[PDB]
Symmetry: C3
Amino acid sequence: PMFIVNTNVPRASVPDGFLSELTQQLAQATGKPPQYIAVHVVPDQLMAFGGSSEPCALCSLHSIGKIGGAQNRSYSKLLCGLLAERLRISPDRVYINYYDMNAANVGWNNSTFA
Amino acid sequence: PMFIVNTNVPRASVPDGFLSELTQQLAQATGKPPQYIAVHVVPDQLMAFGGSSEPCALCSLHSIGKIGGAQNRSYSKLLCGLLAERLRISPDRVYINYYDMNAANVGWNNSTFA
Amino acid sequence: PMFIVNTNVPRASVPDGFLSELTQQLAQATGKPPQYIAVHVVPDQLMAFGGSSEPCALCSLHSIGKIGGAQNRSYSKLLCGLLAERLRISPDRVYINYYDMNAANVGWNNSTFA
Ligand SMILES: *C(=S)NCCCC[S@@](C)=O
Ligand SMILES: *C(=S)NCCCC[S@@](C)=O
Ligand SMILES: [Cl-]
Ligand SMILES: [Cl-]
Ligand SMILES: [Cl-]
Ligand SMILES: [Cl-]
Ligand SMILES: [Cl-]
Ligand SMILES: [Cl-]
Ligand SMILES: [Cl-]
Ligand code: NA
Ligand code: NA
Ligand code: NA
Ligand code: NA
């Protein structure tokens, strides 16, 4: 699983341990070992949501399987909750693109998971 | 709709109103209210296009529907025009990846659009 | 072809001419002329892989065709090799998402490749 968050919120407002919490909570959410979870946080971005420059975020969650209608709603409640509580970003100013990746299309360790 | 632009042009060369201009133009192009549109511009990037470092841009346009052969050809003209005038990027040094997203794979406000 | 690398390694550790090496190596691996190849390297990122902040990378390779089981394994060996040699990133701390793009979904110079 790979979770990426792009936001206009300043780096200083990202709480210590945020990447660790994301790793831990995504491991529990996806059911995959935390060892394989990758997290990427990109603050101080130049972005807008609805024409407003107030706090917002554009994210991505890639995973080989464990992606679906019900699961994605669950991931959204989890992730929007964290962005709201930890980064003070309103849930309605966050978009998360979910990708169900084929094992053959994910490279790792000089090979792929296929 | 979500539009992201990654470019090597300096932050100082990105007009302060560019995000709003993109939002408004994309609202008209997609026929969606500006409120639903998110924009993200990433300047000062380390990039090369065709083995050259002159101004260039790698972009992404995500949308739940409103994506297709004909529509994409139209978006390219709209976006290349904006990047050409406001960021000084030659249109033949711009790539735009279009993504037609399923509502179930787009998270927002603690849920998804499905 | 479009190759993007997001890594936590410092900018200073990115060798001069690294972009050129990626361009030429990708031209060889994909068979496409270098004039159409785009490369993007993003260092100094706030990332974690397996919860650890040791050197790691999240990448993407977009291409109209030339994507597949065997081909992707080959690309991974090539790209992980370059990241290990040039950026000192362990191959088991690198993920590469491969995307086989439909020509109609890749915009360039006021149109698409369809
Ligand atoms: C997230 S995309 N992890 C990469 C794929 C892991 C394969 S099995 C160990 O889930
Ligand atoms: C762009 S990806 N907007 C996402 C969906 C916006 C709401 S629907 C009701 O158009
Ligand atoms: Cl599901
Ligand atoms: Cl895939
Ligand atoms: Cl269409
Ligand atoms: Cl989708
Ligand atoms: Cl952890
Ligand atoms: Cl193949
Ligand atoms: Cl596609
Ligand atoms: Na998919
Ligand atoms: Na799609
Ligand atoms: Na940056
Ligand atoms: Na594809």
